[PDB]
Amino acid sequence: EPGWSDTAHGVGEVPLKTDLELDFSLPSSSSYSYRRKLTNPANKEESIPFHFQMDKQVIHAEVQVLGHWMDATFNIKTAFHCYGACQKYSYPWQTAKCFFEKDYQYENGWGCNPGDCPGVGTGCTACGIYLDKLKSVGKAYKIISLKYSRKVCIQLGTEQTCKHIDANDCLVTPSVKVCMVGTVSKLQPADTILFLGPLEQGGIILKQWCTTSCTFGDPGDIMSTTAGMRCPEHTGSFRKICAFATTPVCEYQGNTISGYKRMMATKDSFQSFNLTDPHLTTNKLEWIDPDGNTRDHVNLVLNRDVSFQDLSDNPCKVDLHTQSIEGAWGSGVGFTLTCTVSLTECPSFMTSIKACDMAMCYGSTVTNLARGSNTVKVVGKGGHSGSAFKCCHDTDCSTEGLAASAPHLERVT
Amino acid sequence: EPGWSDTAHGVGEVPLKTDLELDFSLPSSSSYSYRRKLTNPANKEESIPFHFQMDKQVIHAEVQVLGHWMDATFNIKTAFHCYGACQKYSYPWQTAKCFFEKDYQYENGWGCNPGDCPGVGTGCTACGIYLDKLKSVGKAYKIISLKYSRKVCIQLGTEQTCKHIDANDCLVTPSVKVCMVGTVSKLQPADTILFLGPLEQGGIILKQWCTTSCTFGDPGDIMSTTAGMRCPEHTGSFRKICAFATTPVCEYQGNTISGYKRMMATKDSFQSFNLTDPHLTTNKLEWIDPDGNTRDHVNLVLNRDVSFQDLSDNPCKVDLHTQSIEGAWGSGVGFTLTCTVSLTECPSFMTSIKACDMAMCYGSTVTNLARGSNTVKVVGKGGHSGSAFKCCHDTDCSTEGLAASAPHLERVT
Amino acid sequence: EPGWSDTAHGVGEVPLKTDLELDFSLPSSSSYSYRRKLTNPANKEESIPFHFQMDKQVIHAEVQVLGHWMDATFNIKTAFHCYGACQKYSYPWQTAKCFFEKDYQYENGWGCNPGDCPGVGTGCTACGIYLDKLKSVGKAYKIISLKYSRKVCIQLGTEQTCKHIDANDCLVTPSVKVCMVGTVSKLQPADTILFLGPLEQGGIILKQWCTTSCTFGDPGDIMSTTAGMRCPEHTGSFRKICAFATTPVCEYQGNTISGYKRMMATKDSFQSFNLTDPHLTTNKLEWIDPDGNTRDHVNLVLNRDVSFQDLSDNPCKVDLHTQSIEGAWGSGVGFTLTCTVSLTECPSFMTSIKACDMAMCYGSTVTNLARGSNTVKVVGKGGHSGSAFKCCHDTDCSTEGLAASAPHLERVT
Numbered sequence A, B, C: 001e002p003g004w005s006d007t008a009h010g011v012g013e014v015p016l017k018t019d020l021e022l023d024f025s026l027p028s029s030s031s032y033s034y035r036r037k038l039t040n041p042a043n044k045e046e047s048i049p050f051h052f053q054m055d056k057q058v059i060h061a062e063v064q065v066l067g068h069w070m071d072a073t074f075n076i077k078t079a080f081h082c083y084g085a086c087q088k089y090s091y092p093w094q095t096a097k098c099f100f101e102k103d104y105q106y107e108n109g110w111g112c113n114p115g116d117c118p119g120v121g122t123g124c125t126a127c128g129i130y131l132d133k134l135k136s137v138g139k140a141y142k143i144i145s146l147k148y149s150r151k152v153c154i155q156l157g158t159e160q161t162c163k164h165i166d167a168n169d170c171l172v173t174p175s176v177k178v179c180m181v182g183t184v185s186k187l188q189p190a191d192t193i194l195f196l197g198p199l200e201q202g203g204i205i206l207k208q209w210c211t212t213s214c215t216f217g218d219p220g221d222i223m224s225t226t227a228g229m230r231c232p233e234h235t236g237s238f239r240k241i242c243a244f245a246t247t248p249v250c251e252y253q254g255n256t257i258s259g260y261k262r263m264m265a266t267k268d269s270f271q272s273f274n275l276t277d278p279h280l281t282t283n284k285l286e287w288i289d290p291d292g293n294t295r296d297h298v299n300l301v302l303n304r305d306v307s308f309q310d311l312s313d314n315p316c317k318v319d320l321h322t323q324s325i326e327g328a329w330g331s332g333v334g335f336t337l338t339c340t341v342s343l344t345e346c347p348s349f350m351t352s353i354k355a356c357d358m359a360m361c362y363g364s365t366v367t368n369l370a371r372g373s374n375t376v377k378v379v380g381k382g383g384h385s386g387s388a389f390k391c392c393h394d395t396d397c398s399t400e401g402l403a404a405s406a407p408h409l410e411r412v413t
């Protein structure tokens, strides 16, 4: 009754026929090497070479590049005009990177009038707040997805096998099973990481980082991006100060201190993380976490008996073509690839269809294929503008790929 | 010296007497089936049938139903009355779902007076902001608790055993141990999940969702619930515009754009999750995560020797009665069930007492029972209004159950 | 080719030579005890005593003490002076714990003047909001780091070994390997935990707790610390009410309800956690989580064959001296200890260097030492003012330690 499947990564074994078991925890930032001449195959005249290599864990993050976080100074200036409307004149703050203007139009009923202006209900008094002394204070990225893997190389006799194993996965070679359990994520999807210096000097994790309502003083309030400045809103209140024969003066009741200055005063409240040999290219960040306390559990079984049974073996063949796509690249909501998967050589097949481009894969769907044609939907997260996403099974991908839409990542107002 | 205990789920075994070990990782959205005729019991004339079935992982979430998130339009209108107080008249905005009013009372010292109203320090000018064009944009739930389990069925010969195994737990039958490790939680307790459409189309995870201070423009600002509308506060400032002989006009300095419009502009900043075959009934949401990359580690040991020792075996008997309860159902703080647990047939017993109703269990306490009467406190989370929570050990529950209080889930102001 | 290393905690074994394997899941709040007389060493006349003890899991949190969260009442009062400036007089609100003042100076152009004050553009009207009826409502701590461990004691014959094992780590004695996998963290670094009563009655987890912009009504708005009060900002707007011959009155458009009152109205929206036997000393909180559903996977292997191979064995010797330090204690960003590590008796050595004081260790670096002198940097989190941080390998620490700087944990404005 059990139909064919390749979703289980592992073995059926008989322990009394196991030549060698390794079971151990290993730091993420540690590699591990083991070499031994095995005194079997009960042949004595000839021994069996055995190499096991496990590289340090590499972390891969698909990220949204957010630009440069800016520090700035708050300023306010007043501009009075005796007649006309507030549009009929330009203002000095309009030369600033970020500015917000409130206009008191057609209201100088003596109470608010300079000596030279004998008008009532005319003219305009313009109030403008602007930011200057802008300086870049760090680079920020929002995490779309996180991947954890270790390269593993196995040599049994004169046959070598190397593969990148994802965390909580197993590798199965003809006589060796290697499994990893326990890698846990300190970073989380949608975290914002901030680098006050080069990546090599470590980052800060910020759970509060403004997204939908960026107000001056919020974390991430002033961002300088490739597409120009992103300026914060000012939520305070304006008030026109007036006296006899004196020109009106603007007064603002609101926050004056920038988000960066607010964070540095309590800098030690936030979690840092350190990066060994980070690699940043476009929207991909890879690195090795140097924290020695983060450990995963490693199990190796060397078993050369005929009862050593790879649980994924099957005669099924899968042919793939990419039908359609919807959604966005570089998005935490993601894209959905619609695939046409043809099965031959089996009545049914339970397997995993992935969405991949030239660089890597971004998501995976477990599906139960029937002989002939099937439609499978795969959700991917990550990728970039030039990405042509393909349907893949193992290393076999469809001939043609499909580009996703640009993500909606913009402020309102 | 070791007293009896049933808290350890697992075995003591001798590996050289193990007939069969399976060790493998499996996607959460994958099932697994294995059938084999075992060529033992060294009897040859007769073989041993063996079935192993593992269902896809099911996720169970106890949720707080938050109602419908609403999109709306911001509006402001002015109402002047020449004499009397602002209470002495009704206003058009009072017909709206959400409205906020600020009244300028007894202040028209000429500066603020229409031509027809020759009064000073009398009358009132009422300012009112209201929301209209309300449309439902999705359904939101806050997660109280998360459970992960897989149904497992074992057939050895002509004897079958099926049980739901929780993640990071083991099942022990007479000759089979099955264990699961490594399932990790993407959703977290107190997350808010938002469904812009039917559950089958997936949800959005929102770390920022207003709870204690809902302001217009916040995520979750305007909620339409069974108990009526929940309206956001407006934190901006009002100002009475005045000119000669013209009637006063209200002006507001504050946010105008709704929370929903703010999110959609940056929709791709947030994490989505997808649901296969979701089931929603009252405050319970169950589903299968279709993400193929989420794997758990599965270990099966088939061992028929007399040294195969179930570590939970014991002669102890436990009788239960539900004494008292405090706390709330449907709450992330929870309720505390106070139980009276009588032990017989053992001098002491280390065991787990659970809080359960008709549907499921909601929490568990490990306790060291002494022969005779004991008091045990169990913290549960979840449940609903009709829940009668009982003290249980294994499948044995107390005769009577106790209802918890309603949760405090309300805005102030 | 493989150089020496002690980073792998575990064994190489032959399963057919294993006398006994235990494999089981165990609640965190449960201990486990196993005693058996092993009928080997195939000697029959003499048996082998075997004890295995596993204590309940203990949670250790390095915390930032935040003081007492305060509830308060909002108040506003007005003070008019006919002449002079607003500084020329004191005010009743200046006697309050928290107060904020806005001064309307030199503006009484008749419109705002009491009958007795015949001045224009002179005097001042001072507006002051203050908080009273302050009452402590709980104690709050921000989590810097979390550690999970179980004490384990092994007796084989007449030889005993006890050690605290960290989660996801293994202990290796001459013939026993014990490993733990699967402990997962419910609390997270940078979480804020709030205790409305004694620690024994449980805490509340709050993802939103004000850090960089504390506004009246935010969670954690009013904190009473050892260094005095920490007062919230008020972001609303002021307005001077005026009429004929009457003295001006202040009006505020802003939040009036405190953060504590706002939380209690929706108290059941937040996650609680319970503590068995908590220990608080300065900035260290230790406890046992009584939730019976949290389980870890335990594996014990008893194997007395000569092929039982501890993977960390090595002849290398390491000598340590503490060179320099930068960073802060009690910080989530942490400190960096710079160590001088001398290797002898090996050409190279892959090992872990830790940062420790008298109490415990706070971080760890995996490094590849060359024969002779090396510089290693270790990142630690936690500690306190008197901490002298040392470079350590295993139980061997440097003679002298170095104190870190105080953390920057202050509000601006």
Ligand SMILES: *[C@@H]1O[C@H](CO)[C@@H](O[C@@H]2O[C@H](CO)[C@@H](O[C@@H]3O[C@H](CO)[C@@H](O)[C@H](O[C@H]4O[C@H](CO)[C@@H](O)[C@H](O)[C@@H]4O)[C@@H]3O)[C@H](O)[C@H]2NC(C)=O)[C@H](O)[C@H]1NC(C)=O
Pocket: A196, A200, A201, A202, A203, A204, A267, A272, A273, A274, C326, C333, C336, C377, C378, C379
């Ligand atoms: C692990 O990550 C943490 C967090 O990123 C990281 O902490 C950072 O360490 C750097 C390195 O020392 C700190 O940057 C220094 O800050 C001091 C004062 O704050 C400055 O004086 C330094 O600049 C001077 O020195 C330079 C040295 O050549 C000169 O080139 C320069 O012109 C200046 O004269 C220097 O910038 C930084 O402050 C912390 N970050 C925080 C948030 O505190 C830690 O070092 C990382 N550890 C490891 C082992 O990687």
Ligand SMILES: *[C@@H]1O[C@H](CO)[C@@H](O[C@@H]2O[C@H](CO)[C@@H](O[C@@H]3O[C@H](CO)[C@@H](O)[C@H](O[C@H]4O[C@H](CO)[C@@H](O)[C@H](O)[C@@H]4O)[C@@H]3O)[C@H](O)[C@H]2NC(C)=O)[C@H](O)[C@H]1NC(C)=O
Pocket: A326, A333, A336, A377, A378, A379, B196, B200, B201, B202, B203, B204, B267, B272, B273, B274
């Ligand atoms: C996994 O989860 C994600 C997140 O939920 C999910 O993304 C959603 O996909 C749906 C399905 O296509 C999207 O809804 C569509 O949106 C487009 C434009 O945004 C509309 O044109 C669509 O409505 C039209 O088409 C319908 C088809 O019959 C008609 O009935 C209708 O009348 C309209 O004419 C449709 O609503 C949705 O936008 C996204 N969500 C987000 C946040 O982007 C994804 O599809 C899920 N994947 C799988 C495999 O389940």
Ligand SMILES: *[C@@H]1O[C@H](CO)[C@@H](O[C@@H]2O[C@H](CO)[C@@H](O[C@@H]3O[C@H](CO)[C@@H](O)[C@H](O[C@H]4O[C@H](CO)[C@@H](O)[C@H](O)[C@@H]4O)[C@@H]3O)[C@H](O)[C@H]2NC(C)=O)[C@H](O)[C@H]1NC(C)=O
Pocket: B326, B333, B336, B377, B378, B379, C196, C200, C201, C202, C203, C204, C267, C272, C273, C274
């Ligand atoms: C697990 O953690 C949760 C969260 O901390 C915890 O819930 C708390 O339980 C306590 C204990 O009952 C509650 O405190 C009580 O609250 C009621 C009304 O809210 C008060 O009447 C109580 O005070 C009276 O009774 C005392 C008993 O002697 C008297 O000494 C006192 O003078 C008063 O007359 C009492 O304070 C608390 O409300 C909850 N917390 C929340 C947030 O709801 C739960 O009990 C913990 N469970 C276990 C098993 O530890």
